[PDB]
């Protein structure tokens, strides 16, 4: 059909031709020459060469390059036949069927968001206004502020005050699909909740950078917007970052802390043989935090803190105990981050990287999935807080 091989116009006025149109023109011209020569009762020698040229023209139209030499026109390059549009990387399968270009998508440079949670990300307002056009149009037509769709389009293009309120209303519980360019496994496309920020960069959580394998030296990521209820439920239940905490290749976690968090938790949980406030009895972790923030006790000082740890060794219920531990000031401050089900022997040592990894493993093994996300978020928060004070 002619729409599958069109003749495009140019600015100069000359209509440029394609490869298939040239091959079809060659085949039709050779067939017309053969018919005109057969009408005039030619001898066999000329019509044998004419039938041979028609055979070569048909073979060049079907698959140019198999038999003989591929014909070149004005470019010293082989022409495209009907078989070149099906096979190869630029065929209809790998370029138009297996991988396509989709709507409701964007792309920007990623940055770091320390204040974000594990299930949310920072989305710019200039991208959220473009990716959520018909939702804002439907909400403006429902609220009655714009009866005509052209009035709603002009209200969005003018960027009025209620447009940002509608955009904040249609984004609160609508997830987006963030994706990096090399997708080696299934953790390269995760779902997050958009947070309207000011700027042109995407704020990414620091804990998902190990799963994404993306630092912040110029990396870019693509966003996608689900529209149907089934797609939103598949993003919330299957593709959410809080649901993918174990790798399906071997079972190891993918929410391991990076260098700044383990550096802060290593500097906080250490001790020296002589410091300010060494050798005093403390009544709890709140007095340790008060003595650290008041400037009367160092972060590395061997003290005696009365702790209250819980243990769930019974049939589901938790049993409490109270004793005097020989610990430091920073480990008591980190003990407020640790939940009730975990013991005290996992925090009384110097926290490296595998120690925090096995701490998160023990928390996910004993408590479950829901406190583990809050524990990892609070660990990242206190690591970023105590790496700056050092």
Partner DNA sequence: GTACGGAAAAATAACACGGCGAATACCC
Partner DNA sequence: GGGTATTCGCCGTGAATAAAAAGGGTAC
Partner RNA sequence: GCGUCGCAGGCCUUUUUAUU
Partner RNA sequence: CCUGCGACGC
SS (H, E, C) 335-367: HCCCCCCCCCCCCCCCCCCHHHHHHHHHHHHHC
- 336 vs 136: CA distance, rounded Å: 44
Q: With binding defined as CB under 8 A, does residue 310 bind other proteins?
A: no
Q: With binding defined as CB under 8 A, does residue 43 bind other proteins?
A: no
Residue 215 annotated as binding site: yes
Q: Select 28 or 249, whichever has its Cβ closest to DNA.
A: 28
Q: Which does 340 bind (CB under 5 to 8 A by kind): Mg ion, DNA, RNA, none?
A: none
Q: Select 212 or 292, whichever has its Cβ closest to RNA.
A: 212
Q: With binding defined as CB under 8 A, does residue 229 bind other proteins?
A: yes
Query: Binding to RNA (CB under 7 A): which residues in 166-195?
Result: 180-182
Locate all alpha helices (DSSP H) within 213-353, ordered by sequence.
Answer: 229-237, 259-268, 285-294, 329-335
- 270 vs 300: CA distance, rounded Å: 6
Q: With binding defined as CB under 7 A, does residue 140 bind RNA?
A: no
In the three-class reduction of DSSP (H, G, I as helix; E, B as strand; rest coil), residue 135 is classed as helix
Helix (H) or strand (E) holding 386: helix 370-386
- 75 vs 5: CA distance, rounded Å: 20
- Least Å distance between CB 110 and DNA? 15
- 97 vs 157: CA distance, rounded Å: 35
Ramachandran sector of residue 72 (left: φ over 0; alpha: ψ -120 to 50; beta: rest):
beta
Q: With binding defined as CB under 7 A, does residue 75 bind RNA?
A: yes
Q: With binding defined as CB under 7 A, does residue 74 bind RNA?
A: no
Number of residues that bind other proteins (CB under 8 A): 127
Q: Which residues contact 53 (CB under 8 A, 6 or more apart)?
A: 30
- Least Å distance between CB 218 and DNA? 13
**303-311 sheet: strands from edge to edge:** 281-282, 303-311, 319-327
Q: Which stretch binds other proteins (CB under 8 A): 94-102, 310-318, 331-339, 366-374?
A: 94-102
Q: Select 219 or 260, whichever has its Cβ closest to Mg ion.
A: 219
- Estimate to the nearest angstrom the gap between the alpha carbon of 288 and the chain centroid: 40
Q: Select 18 or 357, whichever has its Cβ closest to DNA.
A: 18
Q: With binding defined as CB under 8 A, does residue 320 bind other proteins?
A: no
Q: Select 179 or 362, whichever has its Cβ closest to other proteins.
A: 179
- Interface map 257-296 toward RNA (x if CB under 7 A): ----------------------------------------
Positions at the binding site: 215, 217, 219
Contacts with RNA by CB under 7 A lie at 6, 8-9, 11, 16, 18-19, 75, 77, 80, 90, 148, 150, 153, 180-182, 214, 217-220
């Amino acid at each position: 059909p002619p729409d599958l091989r069109p003749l495009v116009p140019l600015d100069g006025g000359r209509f440029a031709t394609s490869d298939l149109n040239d091959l079809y023109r060659r085949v039709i011209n050779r067939n017309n020459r053969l018919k005109r020569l057969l009408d005039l009762a030619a001898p066999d020698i000329i019509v044998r060469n004419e039938k041979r040229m028609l055979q070569e023209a048909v073979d060049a139209l079907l698959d140019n390059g198999r038999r003989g030499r591929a014909i070149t026109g004005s470019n010293k390059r082989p022409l495209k036949s009907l078989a070149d549009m099906i096979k190869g990387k630029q065929g209809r399968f790998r370029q138009n069927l297996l991988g396509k270009r989709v709507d409701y998508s964007g792309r920007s440079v990623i940055t770091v968001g320390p204040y974000l949670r594990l299930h949310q990300c920072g989305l710019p307002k200039k991208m959220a206004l473009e990716l959520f056009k018909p939702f804002i149009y439907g909400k403006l037509e429902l609220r009655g502020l714009a009866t005509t769709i052209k009035a709603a389009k002009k209200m969005v293009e003018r960027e009025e005050a209620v447009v940002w309120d509608i955009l904040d209303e249609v984004i609160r519980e609508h997830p987006v699909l963030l994706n990096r360019a090399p997708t080696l496994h299934r953790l390269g496309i995760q779902a997050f909740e958009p947070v309207l920020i000011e700027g042109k960069a995407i704020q990414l959580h620091p804990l998902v950078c190990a799963a994404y394998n993306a630092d912040f030296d110029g990396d870019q990521m693509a966003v996608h917007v689900p529209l149907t209820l089934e797609a939103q439920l598949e993003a919330r239940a299957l593709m959410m970052s809080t649901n993918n905490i174990l790798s399906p290749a071997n079972g190891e976690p993918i929410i391991v802390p990076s260098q700044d968090v383990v550096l802060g938790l290593y500097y906080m949980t250490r001790d020296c043989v002589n410091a300010k406030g060494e050798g005093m009895v403390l009544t709890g972790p709140k007095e340790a935090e008060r003595l650290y923030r008041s400037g009367l006790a160092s972060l590395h000082a061997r003290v005696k803190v009365r702790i209250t740890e819980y243990e769930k060794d019974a049939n589901g219920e938790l049993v409490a105990k109270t004793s005097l531990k020989d610990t430091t000031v920073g480990r008591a401050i980190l003990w407020m981050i640790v939940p009730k089900g975990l013991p005290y022997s996992i925090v009384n040592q110097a926290l490296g990287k595998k120690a925090i990894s096995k701490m998160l493993n023990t928390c996910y093994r004993i408590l479950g999935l829901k406190p583990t996300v809050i524990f990892a978020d609070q660990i990242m928060y206190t690591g970023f807080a105590y790496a700056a004070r050092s």
